[model samples]
Target: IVGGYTCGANTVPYQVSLNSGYHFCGGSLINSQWVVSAAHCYKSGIQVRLGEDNINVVEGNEQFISASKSIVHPSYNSNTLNNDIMLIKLKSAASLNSRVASISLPTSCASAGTQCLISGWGNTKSSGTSYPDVLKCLKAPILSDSSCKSAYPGQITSNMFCAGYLEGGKDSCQGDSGGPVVCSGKLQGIVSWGSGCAQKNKPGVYTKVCNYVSWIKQTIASN
Candidate 1:
């Protein structure tokens, strides 16, 4: 995340590291058996690391679980990045504890200008050489649809929303895709894409979670 600092242990118990042969994305543990992430992050051999604060060190709280199945949104368009969401089913349920828990889902959309937090082990800079060893977090405000539209020019849709700074200091960068955007103590959005890491007038775009609640519930139920 742009302009982020190392997160404290157990502060974000719902956060998860998605490893597809390597650490390529982040995810949110919505339940003991399910994880939500960006559809664009789909890859083979996906696994999940829970209760982890530092990626480089294996802690007693950490649990690595292989994904039994992954379901990407049927209407997801990678080119336009529409409906950019996905669900991963774990091979087994996670054992919840102080360091491992699930986040609550939102029943409604977050209002514009609401402050939110994004966390992940994504790049600190656009041209960074390596991902952070520990999870990083940054605070940003949700931008209005009109404001977001002005930046992308007809690309913003109902399934997507925007967050970050227009001044080019805070954003979700590469490798942060599929991470959580928490607002009002709930899962409000998923880090989907952006023009660049902390670029001027280019706020990070996210998959709006409220718009897909029905789909998410149905998918989880059927699976």
Candidate 2:
């Protein structure tokens, strides 16, 4: 996250980082064996890392879990980046502890102007040269549906929403997709896409999780 600080020692316990050879996208541990990320970050043979603080320096409290399978939203559109959420089933269940746990699903939608926390290990600058070693988080306010639509014109879909400063500064960026947008300690959205890292009138867009709670629940129950 641009202009954000490192999360204090696994304080964001639900955060999960997807790694192949290195940190890529971030996810949240929704349950012991299920991870909710973005469809855009979809790829086979992904290694899910939980209980992680800094990817560069392992503190010996991390778990490297394999993904048994993944299920993307049936209606996901790559071209428009709509319905961009995905569910991952871990090869085995994660051991929950003070440093590793699941985030509760959203009870309701976060309205416009509702402040939320967006956390991940993504680029710290819009220049795209630097990605953080430690997890970073920003406090951003959700924008109205219409406000988000206006920000992207015809690209914005009902399944997508945005949060951040239109005047610039803070936002989720590269390597942050599939991460959590938590409102009141509940998962509210997933980092999906944006025009840039953080720009004026171009807040980072995310997949609205409230609209897919049923899909997430049903998918995990059967798989």
For each candidate, the alpha-carbon lDDT, in order, equals 0.92, 0.91
Put down candidate 1 lDDT per residue, 113-217, tens digits, no spaces.
999999999999865655788899999999999999999998988888999999998889998999999998999999998897999999999999999999999
lDDT of 2 at 9: 82
**In lDDT terms, which candidate is top?**
1
Candidate 2: where is the Cα deviation over 4 Å?
A: none
lDDT of 2 at 117: 93
The worst-scoring run of ten residues by lDDT in candidate 1 lies at 125-134
Query: Per-residue lDDT tens digits of candidate 2, residues 52-118?
Result: 9989887978999988898888888899898899999999999999999999999788899999999
State every prediction's TM-score relative to the real structure: 0.97, 0.98
Position 159, candidate 1: lDDT: 89
Separate clash counts for every candidate: 0, 0
